[PDB]
């Protein structure tokens, strides 16, 4: 403001401002035994299978 | 849920229920006179029969 009175006037103004991210996470978990990955590569040996 | 907090995560879940059947039982009872049952067979010759 340019007022006219004895209050001390003042220049331009300018700021700087400066953000900065974050980072985040997740992890899951899979159900998988190795009885099921045997039978997996075997077949045709019957027609249960 | 994964989630990235400081936790061990947890497997995959699976439930098994079990159900069953009800017995029940019904009686109902009728008389019948045994003056109605001869003359349920009777040989129907009169007028009065």
Redesign the interface.
């Given at each position: 403001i340019a007022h006219g009175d004895g209050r001390r006037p003042n220049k331009q103004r300018q700021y700087i401002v400066m953000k900065a991210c974050n980072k985040?996470?997740?992890?899951?978990?899979?159900?998988l035994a190795a009885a099921d990955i045997e039978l997996l590569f075997a077949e045709k040996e019957t027609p249960l299978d």
């Open positions: 985040h996470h997740i992890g899951a978990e899979i159900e």
